[PDB]
Amino acid sequence: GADGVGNSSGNWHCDSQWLGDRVITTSTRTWALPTYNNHLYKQISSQSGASNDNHYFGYSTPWGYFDFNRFHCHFSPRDWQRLINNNWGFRPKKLSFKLFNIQVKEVTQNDGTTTIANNLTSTVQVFTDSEYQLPYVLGSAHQGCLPPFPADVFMVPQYGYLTLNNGSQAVGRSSFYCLEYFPSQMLRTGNNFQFSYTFEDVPFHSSYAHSQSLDRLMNPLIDQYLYYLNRTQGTTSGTTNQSRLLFSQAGPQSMSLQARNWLPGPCYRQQRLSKTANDNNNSNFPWTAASKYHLNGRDSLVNPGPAMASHKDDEEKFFPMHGNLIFGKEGTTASNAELDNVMITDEEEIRTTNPVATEQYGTVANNLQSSNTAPTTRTVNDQGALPGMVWQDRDVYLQGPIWAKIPHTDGHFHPSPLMGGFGLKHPPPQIMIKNTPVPANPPTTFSPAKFASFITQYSTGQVSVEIEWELQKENSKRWNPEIQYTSNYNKSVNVDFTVDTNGVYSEPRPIGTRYLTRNL
Amino acid sequence: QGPIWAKIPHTDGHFHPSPLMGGFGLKHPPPQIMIKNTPVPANPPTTFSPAKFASFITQYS
Amino acid sequence: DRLMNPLIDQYLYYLNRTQGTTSGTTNQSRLLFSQAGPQSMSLQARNWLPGPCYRQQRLSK
Ligand SMILES: Nc1ncnc2c1ncn2[C@H]1C[C@H](O)[C@@H](COP(=O)(O)O)O1
Ligand SMILES: Nc1ncnc2c1ncn2[C@H]1C[C@H](O)[C@@H](COP(=O)(O)O)O1
């Protein structure tokens, strides 16, 4: 693709249409790119004795990058509703990336006024980490994605990565990556950038909730043919009746004693919190009493753990200590914001396959009972994996992460990103972008010294992203209507998912995905 | 006299999908075969009644 | 107006009593609804209207 100055290098493709078996979303946004790090690679690390479990070492690059690992980058609210309310599941298929209508602007502070002018001969550099040789910094819920609202212009994030570290110091096996050591396409105004990607085979997401329960699985009307022991001593308690071994045949009556075929999913107990700031202990325990793990003598918070339900029946006020994902409302400090300023996600559809996050797991025996010894019971707060266990995964939300790169290790278990979504061995590659350095006035005499005098300039253009989604259609013989997402028909102030009096788009609530029901 | 197979629950995750009571765990097991006697109404009224029909001939198969 | 079935009642309901109730003690008014019947023949729900009109004066021979 090569055209002229007064000729656009692309069009605005922002649309979505459905094919009953699949859906194609196209999304275009305007982007702006500054000059990060002053065209310099800078070594970064932790403050000399500021914190210990936060010690780190890495580098900062003059490169920006494109991100669209959020669902609202592609699905308008209305669309998300169509998807959510009609499909057993869904997944990604293809991807088309396009950069175009590029403009390079250089600015000058002459006196007390900034003039901005065109630098037509200036270039910009783009490339894609398709061999995954660069540290994958996406799928970490960072900021700088495409604006949920198409009319919103966004700033392109800067690229930085972390390496291996011993405290604030580094090791010998630490890796330094130069992005100038990658072949990249240079673009002038009227040039453009093309890219296509094909997702791998990754299971459909669960856009459903089970209409049955792991324990309420059998026939309510018939008794089993298996027997269990329910009386150890209790007999005809009158004369000469100390103890006896008695067995009962399973019945719809003994519903939680019947022989079973499957187990609930794994668990890692979280601490229970209440939204009412007075049910809780008068202490500050978000760290000393929260669940966590430690690698190399460094404690890390187990924020979203295994998929566990948020609360039990008849509660809805108790949420796991960070046992779920939380989104911040529009306009809310990054530092200690009120509970009325955030949006907490309820995972109450998986109550049927998974243990509750705050509750125990079950009961294990740990002794050899006899006439001499009384049988001991121990509450299990942590459960690894077991043959027979089944479970559901974390939901995805309109503004949640989509995919995540699966770490290249010797072993994985259930490679589903813990924050939710699609785990990929080879995910959509990273797209790097940066303004090419333009030297300012050079000396008539030759100076070997590092060149530091540059013309200040930023870039702007459009970006387009087209993704094809495969849908799993609903096939239910449920007679009664199912629950659907819907807006309040009530006379309301502002309209949900809209701009306000002074033009600011805002998403009212987090949107789940499990509205339709399937059987176990 | 034990169980033979068992349907594997349609969830996001399983581990070792062998039925815990023993046997063969199947994603798609032998389907359920339903059977029932078709309702045979008894003497109807010469006058039209909208009310739910409840008078049936008792019979087994 | 004589278009429906003389033998069967409708499944639609109309309001035919606004006050008239068990007119004895403490019975001023109440909202009561009756299901259309061959009996309530000119009260039943309808599907069509008669033609337009422009009243003329009446004369006798
Ligand atoms: N998001 C995602 N990506 C890939 N696989 C998933 C995902 N979620 C669940 N699984 C399941 C599907 C396969 O049966 C299994 C492969 O594990 P393996 O370790 O590859 O043998 O992991
Ligand atoms: N009864 C029964 N049915 C199916 N598979 C069984 C059974 N017993 C053991 N396995 C083993 C065989 C496969 O290697 C594995 C597939 O797990 P998956 O979760 O399918 O990846 O589970």
XYZ file of C-alpha atoms and ligand atoms in Angstrom:
686
model
C 0.000 0.000 0.000
C 1.578 3.224 -1.266
C -0.271 6.450 -2.111
C 0.120 10.227 -1.918
C -0.140 13.115 0.531
C -3.591 14.341 -0.481
C -5.027 10.837 -0.640
C -6.404 8.913 2.336
C -4.809 5.511 2.961
C -7.996 3.911 4.303
C -11.641 4.264 5.343
C -13.707 4.225 8.535
C -15.011 0.704 9.020
C -16.934 0.526 12.269
C -19.814 -1.916 12.011
C -21.064 -5.355 13.019
C -23.407 -7.830 11.362
C -24.602 -11.304 12.271
C -24.600 -14.494 10.221
C -26.542 -16.679 12.644
C -23.537 -18.992 12.807
C -20.975 -16.254 13.380
C -20.574 -12.515 13.921
C -18.116 -10.023 12.471
C -17.168 -6.951 14.464
C -15.198 -4.122 12.908
C -13.870 -1.275 15.040
C -12.061 1.938 14.110
C -10.623 4.576 16.450
C -8.383 7.636 16.272
C -5.040 7.389 18.072
C -2.223 9.734 19.089
C 1.407 8.891 19.773
C 3.937 11.042 21.685
C 7.684 10.551 21.946
C 8.230 8.268 24.925
C 11.440 8.194 26.963
C 12.792 10.920 24.705
C 13.834 8.263 22.170
C 15.824 6.501 24.899
C 15.966 3.011 26.369
C 16.077 3.445 30.147
C 16.871 0.849 32.802
C 14.233 0.831 35.521
C 14.050 -0.874 38.911
C 12.739 -0.592 42.461
C 13.242 2.336 44.843
C 16.313 1.899 47.049
C 14.554 0.205 49.971
C 10.977 1.280 49.266
C 9.306 -2.136 49.255
C 10.267 -5.852 49.294
C 7.483 -7.938 47.720
C 7.393 -5.296 45.002
C 11.076 -5.423 44.065
C 11.522 -5.533 40.296
C 13.940 -4.935 37.430
C 13.364 -4.168 33.758
C 13.544 -1.593 30.975
C 11.587 1.255 29.401
C 11.404 1.619 25.613
C 10.618 4.590 23.328
C 8.034 2.324 21.685
C 4.248 2.405 21.934
C 1.895 -0.490 21.258
C -1.692 -1.285 20.299
C -4.095 -3.080 22.608
C -7.650 -4.318 22.104
C -7.831 -7.139 24.638
C -11.124 -5.774 26.005
C -14.539 -6.937 24.807
C -16.024 -3.431 24.659
C -13.384 -2.670 22.023
C -15.498 -4.675 19.588
C -19.015 -5.224 20.927
C -21.387 -2.315 21.325
C -23.681 -2.775 24.336
C -26.629 -3.677 22.110
C -24.525 -6.319 20.355
C -23.267 -7.786 23.608
C -26.941 -8.160 24.508
C -27.701 -10.059 21.287
C -24.770 -12.368 21.931
C -25.458 -12.870 25.640
C -29.161 -13.637 25.310
C -29.016 -16.108 22.438
C -25.890 -18.266 22.445
C -24.682 -21.328 24.377
C -21.146 -20.053 23.746
C -18.718 -18.240 21.446
C -15.060 -17.836 20.448
C -12.625 -15.840 18.257
C -11.736 -16.945 14.719
C -9.900 -14.410 12.542
C -8.396 -10.937 12.846
C -7.551 -8.068 10.486
C -5.399 -5.153 11.627
C -4.949 -1.879 9.764
C -3.148 1.414 10.370
C -3.830 4.347 8.084
C -4.438 8.053 7.542
C -1.204 8.798 9.364
C -0.165 12.351 10.202
C 3.127 13.392 11.775
C 3.056 16.707 13.621
C 6.051 18.585 14.998
C 5.621 21.259 17.665
C 7.681 24.282 18.705
C 7.644 26.415 21.863
C 8.963 29.688 20.438
C 7.973 32.243 23.078
C 4.922 31.538 25.205
C 2.857 29.976 22.424
C 2.948 26.457 20.937
C 2.640 26.241 17.164
C 1.952 22.816 15.658
C 2.833 22.106 12.027
C 3.025 19.285 9.481
C 6.181 17.275 9.004
C 5.336 15.541 5.734
C 8.722 13.886 5.221
C 8.709 12.353 8.710
C 8.125 8.621 9.221
C 6.833 6.152 11.800
C 7.829 2.555 12.512
C 5.517 -0.423 12.952
C 6.058 -4.139 13.382
C 4.476 -7.198 14.952
C 6.013 -9.694 17.361
C 4.829 -12.737 15.404
C 7.546 -15.075 16.655
C 6.830 -14.003 20.226
C 10.445 -13.080 20.881
C 9.402 -10.061 22.925
C 7.920 -10.358 26.448
C 4.130 -10.523 26.116
C 2.893 -7.551 28.133
C -0.763 -7.857 27.112
C -3.440 -9.828 28.952
C -2.518 -8.136 32.220
C -5.555 -5.833 32.296
C -3.382 -2.767 31.663
C -4.838 0.507 30.427
C -4.604 2.087 26.986
C -6.994 -0.161 25.081
C -9.427 1.087 22.443
C -12.146 3.384 23.862
C -15.507 1.633 24.434
C -17.059 4.601 22.642
C -16.018 4.953 18.970
C -16.044 8.765 19.114
C -13.382 8.764 21.846
C -9.778 9.407 20.828
C -7.130 7.554 22.815
C -3.436 7.836 23.672
C -1.203 4.900 22.725
C 0.414 3.125 25.748
C 4.184 2.971 26.211
C 6.019 -0.355 26.131
C 7.904 -1.662 29.148
C 8.821 -5.105 30.420
C 10.173 -6.873 33.493
C 13.018 -9.376 33.671
C 14.510 -11.653 36.291
C 15.561 -9.952 39.528
C 17.154 -10.441 42.939
C 15.613 -7.598 44.912
C 16.356 -4.290 43.201
C 19.395 -5.877 41.549
C 19.421 -8.092 38.464
C 20.822 -11.546 37.723
C 23.187 -12.707 34.977
C 20.400 -14.494 33.112
C 18.431 -11.267 32.675
C 17.383 -10.350 29.145
C 17.690 -6.992 27.397
C 15.480 -6.496 24.348
C 16.077 -3.811 21.737
C 13.109 -3.167 19.454
C 15.339 -1.455 16.903
C 16.819 -4.905 16.355
C 13.545 -5.945 14.739
C 12.708 -5.423 11.064
C 9.925 -2.832 10.989
C 7.933 -1.115 8.254
C 8.495 2.639 8.032
C 5.498 4.743 7.011
C 5.182 8.270 5.646
C 1.856 10.091 5.248
C -0.162 8.099 2.731
C 1.518 4.844 3.636
C -0.399 2.236 5.622
C 0.001 -1.004 7.561
C -1.721 -4.342 7.016
C -1.942 -7.453 9.180
C -4.026 -10.642 9.457
C -4.168 -13.280 12.193
C -5.945 -16.593 12.768
C -6.863 -17.746 16.278
C -6.185 -21.303 17.411
C -8.678 -23.957 18.500
C -9.913 -22.714 21.863
C -13.104 -24.014 23.555
C -16.277 -21.934 23.395
C -16.878 -19.780 26.441
C -19.724 -20.683 28.802
C -22.538 -18.282 27.954
C -24.839 -20.465 30.038
C -25.712 -21.510 33.583
C -26.580 -25.055 34.656
C -30.253 -25.676 35.444
C -29.298 -28.575 37.705
C -26.888 -28.965 40.615
C -24.010 -31.411 41.109
C -25.851 -32.780 44.147
C -29.406 -32.552 42.783
C -28.674 -34.775 39.797
C -30.613 -38.007 40.393
C -34.258 -39.092 40.187
C -36.441 -37.528 42.923
C -38.939 -40.380 42.619
C -36.873 -43.573 42.723
C -34.586 -45.047 45.373
C -31.074 -46.273 44.637
C -30.030 -49.919 44.866
C -26.886 -49.030 46.797
C -26.590 -49.038 50.578
C -24.850 -46.716 53.027
C -24.141 -46.886 56.758
C -26.126 -44.290 58.712
C -26.280 -45.752 62.230
C -23.189 -46.694 64.235
C -24.733 -46.925 67.714
C -28.235 -45.457 67.732
C -30.525 -48.468 67.917
C -33.587 -49.586 69.850
C -32.191 -47.498 72.709
C -33.668 -49.252 75.716
C -32.097 -52.321 77.297
C -28.642 -53.766 76.508
C -28.329 -51.556 73.405
C -24.946 -49.838 73.249
C -24.083 -50.001 69.534
C -24.808 -51.740 66.216
C -23.998 -51.531 62.482
C -27.099 -50.568 60.488
C -27.383 -49.792 56.770
C -30.001 -47.831 54.838
C -30.803 -47.937 51.127
C -30.529 -44.537 49.454
C -33.809 -42.692 48.967
C -35.044 -39.354 47.586
C -35.366 -38.693 51.275
C -31.699 -39.302 52.111
C -30.840 -36.941 49.262
C -27.447 -35.750 50.567
C -26.272 -39.206 51.627
C -26.698 -41.077 48.348
C -23.718 -42.501 46.486
C -22.225 -39.921 44.119
C -20.390 -39.957 40.765
C -18.705 -36.540 40.598
C -16.998 -33.898 42.763
C -17.166 -30.085 42.763
C -14.207 -28.094 41.450
C -10.977 -27.254 43.339
C -10.793 -24.455 45.914
C -8.510 -21.955 47.653
C -10.479 -20.308 50.451
C -10.704 -16.508 50.371
C -11.579 -14.241 53.284
C -15.198 -13.076 53.519
C -16.014 -9.359 53.317
C -19.241 -7.424 53.776
C -20.263 -4.307 51.862
C -21.606 -2.805 55.090
C -18.513 -1.273 56.697
C -19.579 -2.366 60.194
C -20.072 -6.123 59.956
C -16.320 -6.408 59.538
C -13.474 -6.616 62.032
C -12.108 -3.248 63.138
C -8.678 -4.033 61.669
C -6.761 -3.477 58.426
C -6.309 -6.972 57.015
C -6.306 -6.759 53.201
C -2.766 -8.175 53.251
C -2.115 -10.011 56.519
C -5.367 -11.967 56.309
C -5.816 -12.383 52.546
C -4.929 -15.464 50.484
C -1.583 -15.311 48.693
C 1.371 -17.315 47.342
C 5.140 -16.834 47.292
C 7.771 -17.412 44.610
C 11.438 -17.000 45.473
C 10.635 -15.558 48.896
C 8.252 -12.985 47.443
C 4.596 -12.879 48.525
C 2.132 -12.267 45.696
C -1.589 -11.736 46.150
C -3.792 -14.514 44.767
C -6.268 -11.958 43.449
C -8.580 -13.915 41.176
C -8.135 -17.496 42.356
C -9.703 -20.684 41.010
C -13.290 -20.183 39.900
C -15.306 -20.214 43.124
C -18.778 -18.813 43.803
C -18.932 -15.381 45.461
C -21.718 -15.985 48.006
C -24.224 -18.616 49.135
C -28.025 -18.452 48.908
C -29.903 -15.639 50.646
C -26.936 -13.273 51.070
C -25.572 -11.368 48.072
C -23.829 -8.897 50.397
C -20.713 -10.932 51.192
C -17.992 -10.818 48.540
C -14.655 -12.692 48.646
C -11.586 -10.718 49.670
C -10.576 -9.789 46.125
C -11.976 -13.184 45.092
C -13.385 -11.580 41.949
C -12.743 -8.874 39.348
C -13.610 -5.248 40.089
C -14.119 -2.391 37.618
C -13.791 1.302 38.420
C -16.582 3.722 37.532
C -15.942 6.604 35.150
C -13.878 9.202 36.989
C -12.555 7.657 40.193
C -9.172 8.056 41.922
C -6.612 5.294 41.381
C -5.869 5.669 45.076
C -8.332 4.503 47.733
C -11.721 5.089 46.132
C -15.046 4.592 47.904
C -17.142 1.430 47.555
C -19.789 3.525 45.807
C -17.169 4.276 43.154
C -16.384 0.734 42.013
C -18.265 -2.136 40.399
C -17.921 -5.585 41.947
C -18.718 -8.722 39.953
C -21.028 -11.448 41.256
C -20.174 -15.038 40.304
C -23.415 -16.695 41.401
C -24.198 -18.771 38.304
C -21.502 -21.357 39.012
C -22.950 -22.184 42.442
C -23.770 -25.601 40.989
C -20.293 -26.806 40.034
C -17.986 -24.794 42.265
C -17.383 -24.359 46.015
C -18.030 -20.969 47.612
C -14.906 -18.804 47.823
C -15.406 -17.680 51.425
C -16.820 -20.941 52.807
C -14.940 -24.147 53.605
C -14.597 -26.950 51.070
C -15.677 -30.063 52.945
C -14.802 -32.497 55.714
C -11.911 -34.952 55.970
C -11.281 -37.612 58.608
C -7.897 -37.740 60.354
C -7.832 -40.510 62.961
C -8.543 -44.182 63.628
C -11.770 -44.170 65.634
C -12.430 -46.990 68.089
C -14.027 -47.554 71.480
C -10.892 -45.904 72.892
C -10.772 -43.009 70.431
C -13.484 -40.546 69.410
C -13.673 -39.866 65.615
C -12.069 -36.545 64.612
C -13.192 -34.208 61.829
C -11.011 -31.621 60.087
C -12.314 -28.762 57.941
C -10.554 -28.619 54.563
C -9.813 -25.059 53.453
C -7.623 -25.972 50.482
C -8.228 -28.603 47.802
C -5.934 -29.673 44.971
C -7.182 -31.599 41.941
C -9.051 -34.908 42.099
C -10.247 -37.553 39.618
C -13.973 -37.010 39.162
C -13.933 -33.274 39.786
C -15.813 -31.039 37.374
C -16.099 -27.261 37.263
C -17.000 -24.093 35.395
C -14.668 -21.189 34.560
C -14.792 -17.453 35.339
C -17.250 -15.352 33.364
C -16.290 -12.675 30.858
C -17.722 -9.187 31.011
C -18.393 -6.604 28.315
C -15.377 -4.676 29.602
C -13.298 -7.695 30.596
C -10.131 -9.233 29.127
C -10.546 -11.403 26.038
C -7.459 -13.613 25.776
C -4.110 -14.256 27.464
C -0.837 -15.832 26.356
C -0.145 -19.217 27.895
C 3.351 -19.131 29.461
C 5.854 -21.335 27.631
C 6.622 -23.820 30.405
C 7.020 -27.581 30.802
C 3.632 -27.869 32.470
C 0.179 -26.332 32.608
C -3.079 -27.589 34.080
C -6.219 -25.825 32.935
C -4.666 -23.055 30.778
C -7.721 -20.792 31.039
C -6.615 -17.267 32.053
C -7.581 -16.850 35.711
C -8.998 -13.381 35.064
C -11.204 -15.156 32.533
C -11.276 -15.569 28.777
C -9.310 -17.482 26.170
C -5.828 -18.848 26.844
C -3.675 -18.998 23.734
C -0.306 -20.611 23.063
C 0.029 -18.154 20.188
C -2.205 -15.101 20.844
C -2.673 -12.021 18.657
C 0.903 -10.687 18.442
C 1.993 -7.321 19.817
C 1.920 -4.392 17.404
C 4.737 -1.926 18.091
C 4.664 1.669 16.900
C 6.981 4.652 17.391
C 7.938 7.980 15.830
C 11.287 7.898 14.055
C 13.835 10.238 15.735
C 14.431 13.472 13.814
C 17.730 15.196 14.718
C 17.790 18.980 15.136
C 20.531 21.407 14.060
C 23.930 19.645 13.972
C 27.289 21.412 14.626
C 29.477 22.430 11.675
C 32.227 20.646 13.596
C 32.187 16.872 14.055
C 31.109 15.682 17.514
C 31.352 11.968 18.452
C 29.166 12.522 21.520
C 25.792 10.780 21.643
C 23.191 12.732 19.682
C 20.651 14.312 22.026
C 19.193 17.313 20.194
C 15.923 16.215 18.570
C 12.890 17.873 17.028
C 9.855 17.318 19.243
C 6.976 15.672 17.397
C 4.020 13.317 17.814
C 1.928 11.223 15.424
C -1.771 10.541 14.869
C -3.874 8.319 12.633
C -6.664 5.767 12.573
C -6.564 2.115 13.526
C -8.982 -0.587 12.440
C -9.536 -4.032 13.945
C -11.783 -6.706 12.461
C -12.558 -9.903 14.330
C -14.684 -12.871 13.314
C -16.501 -14.741 16.056
C -17.913 -18.250 15.954
C -21.188 -18.717 17.814
C -22.581 -21.786 19.537
C -26.349 -21.709 19.032
C -28.947 -22.269 21.746
C -30.759 -25.617 21.700
C -32.993 -25.943 24.758
C -36.276 -27.760 25.408
C -36.919 -25.575 28.450
C -40.655 -24.794 28.412
C -40.675 -21.653 30.571
C -38.963 -18.370 29.589
C -35.332 -17.932 30.623
C -33.817 -14.856 32.232
C -32.560 -12.238 29.790
C -30.542 -9.063 30.140
C -32.695 -5.968 29.721
C -32.777 -2.242 30.407
C -35.076 -0.619 32.961
C -38.205 0.482 31.103
C -38.728 2.838 34.049
C -38.717 6.616 33.691
C -35.002 7.258 34.180
C -32.454 10.065 34.525
C -29.692 9.202 32.067
C -29.802 6.383 29.525
C -27.672 3.308 30.262
C -24.378 3.165 28.337
C -24.461 6.705 26.994
C -22.794 10.119 26.973
C -23.952 12.723 29.506
C -24.643 16.473 29.582
C -20.992 17.291 28.859
C -20.236 14.368 26.549
C -18.657 11.610 28.625
C -19.425 7.967 27.840
C -20.078 5.776 30.878
C -20.819 2.084 31.419
C -23.369 1.685 34.273
C -22.777 -1.924 35.306
C -20.533 -4.910 34.550
C -22.272 -7.327 32.164
C -21.956 -11.075 32.660
C -22.545 -13.702 29.993
C -24.449 -16.530 31.656
C -28.145 -15.790 31.114
C -29.281 -18.841 29.155
C -29.573 -22.226 30.875
C -28.262 -25.662 29.928
C -28.454 -28.962 31.808
C -25.568 -30.850 33.364
C -24.407 -55.877 39.512
C -22.679 -52.498 39.323
C -23.270 -49.427 37.141
C -21.904 -49.549 33.598
C -21.630 -45.958 32.362
C -22.382 -42.382 33.420
C -22.915 -39.115 31.557
C -20.077 -36.642 31.919
C -21.542 -33.295 33.067
C -21.320 -30.583 30.408
C -19.010 -28.152 32.204
C -15.956 -26.036 31.399
C -13.675 -28.435 33.239
C -13.230 -32.069 34.192
C -10.244 -33.970 35.540
C -10.419 -37.737 35.315
C -13.985 -38.147 33.951
C -14.323 -41.731 35.198
C -17.617 -42.111 37.115
C -16.702 -42.266 40.805
C -19.060 -45.192 41.389
C -17.020 -46.900 38.681
C -17.446 -47.668 35.005
C -17.371 -45.732 31.754
C -17.800 -41.959 31.618
C -19.409 -40.770 28.405
C -19.863 -37.303 26.936
C -22.717 -38.790 24.921
C -24.040 -41.928 26.699
C -26.875 -44.225 25.608
C -29.812 -41.786 25.441
C -32.889 -42.023 27.652
C -35.839 -43.967 26.261
C -39.160 -42.476 27.370
C -42.408 -44.426 27.339
C -45.959 -43.643 28.470
C -49.570 -44.676 27.902
C -51.543 -42.170 25.850
C -54.411 -40.619 27.890
C -57.841 -42.003 26.989
C -60.732 -39.712 28.028
C -63.858 -41.254 29.563
C -67.490 -40.227 29.002
C -67.706 -36.528 28.033
C -70.715 -34.265 28.842
C -73.293 -33.530 26.129
C -72.738 -29.906 27.127
C -69.441 -28.147 26.421
C -67.160 -27.726 29.449
C -63.954 -25.634 29.186
C -62.676 -27.042 32.485
C -59.512 -29.146 32.419
C -60.291 -32.725 31.421
C -59.858 -35.069 34.383
C -62.057 -38.101 33.707
C -59.865 -40.816 32.171
C -60.091 -44.538 31.527
C -57.644 -46.385 33.767
C -55.231 -48.571 31.817
C -51.696 -49.969 31.802
C -49.413 -51.406 29.118
C -73.169 -8.034 16.033
C -74.630 -11.542 15.704
C -71.413 -13.031 14.357
C -70.107 -15.355 17.086
C -71.028 -18.802 18.422
C -74.376 -18.833 20.293
C -73.307 -21.925 22.233
C -69.822 -21.160 23.554
C -68.516 -18.481 25.910
C -65.513 -16.304 25.119
C -62.240 -16.467 27.039
C -62.065 -12.685 27.312
C -63.330 -10.664 30.263
C -65.172 -7.354 30.513
C -66.085 -5.067 33.411
C -69.838 -4.981 34.040
C -70.101 -3.909 37.691
C -68.561 -0.704 39.039
C -70.468 -0.415 42.328
C -73.386 -2.845 42.410
C -72.273 -5.584 44.776
C -73.679 -7.551 47.695
C -75.669 -4.405 48.487
C -76.184 -4.756 52.216
C -73.597 -3.663 54.771
C -70.432 -1.632 54.072
C -70.826 -2.146 50.306
C -70.392 1.107 48.397
C -68.434 0.022 45.305
C -66.204 -2.676 43.788
C -64.554 -3.697 40.491
C -66.121 -6.898 39.143
C -65.471 -8.640 35.819
C -67.592 -11.105 33.852
C -66.520 -13.547 31.146
C -68.395 -13.051 27.878
C -71.303 -15.419 27.296
C -74.000 -16.052 24.670
C -76.066 -14.377 27.335
C -74.051 -11.146 27.421
C -74.379 -11.040 23.640
C -74.080 -7.256 23.186
C -71.200 -6.859 25.634
C -68.731 -9.332 24.146
C -65.420 -8.189 22.699
C -65.779 -7.266 19.023
C -63.562 -7.339 15.906
C -65.303 -4.965 13.481
C -67.307 -1.718 13.340
C -70.353 -0.673 11.291
C -69.913 1.771 8.414
C -69.640 5.589 8.659
C -72.689 7.821 9.136
C -74.130 11.300 8.586
C -77.456 11.501 10.409
C -80.490 12.456 8.319
C -83.789 13.806 9.620
C -86.611 11.288 10.069
C -89.836 11.671 8.074
C -93.142 9.821 8.183
C -95.361 9.046 5.201
N -8.542 -21.072 27.237
C -8.126 -22.340 26.999
N -7.136 -22.612 26.122
C -6.720 -23.867 25.882
N -7.243 -24.954 26.482
C -8.251 -24.837 27.380
C -8.750 -23.487 27.698
N -9.728 -23.644 28.612
C -9.833 -24.969 28.857
N -8.949 -25.684 28.146
C -8.849 -27.169 28.188
C -9.208 -27.787 26.845
C -8.355 -29.039 26.746
O -9.147 -30.216 26.969
C -7.270 -28.865 27.800
C -5.903 -28.915 27.157
O -4.847 -28.841 28.122
P -3.309 -28.969 27.657
O -2.526 -28.468 28.852
O -3.201 -28.086 26.424
O -3.121 -30.446 27.361
O -7.511 -27.622 28.478
N -14.499 -43.214 31.597
C -13.690 -42.346 30.943
N -14.140 -41.577 29.928
C -13.341 -40.715 29.276
N -12.039 -40.537 29.570
C -11.444 -41.248 30.560
C -12.264 -42.207 31.323
N -11.452 -42.764 32.240
C -10.231 -42.205 32.083
N -10.221 -41.290 31.101
C -9.010 -40.531 30.679
C -8.603 -40.882 29.257
C -7.992 -39.609 28.696
O -6.561 -39.713 28.631
C -8.447 -38.502 29.635
C -9.222 -37.451 28.870
O -9.599 -36.345 29.697
P -10.352 -35.072 29.062
O -10.904 -34.336 30.266
O -11.415 -35.666 28.150
O -9.265 -34.320 28.315
O -9.228 -39.105 30.679
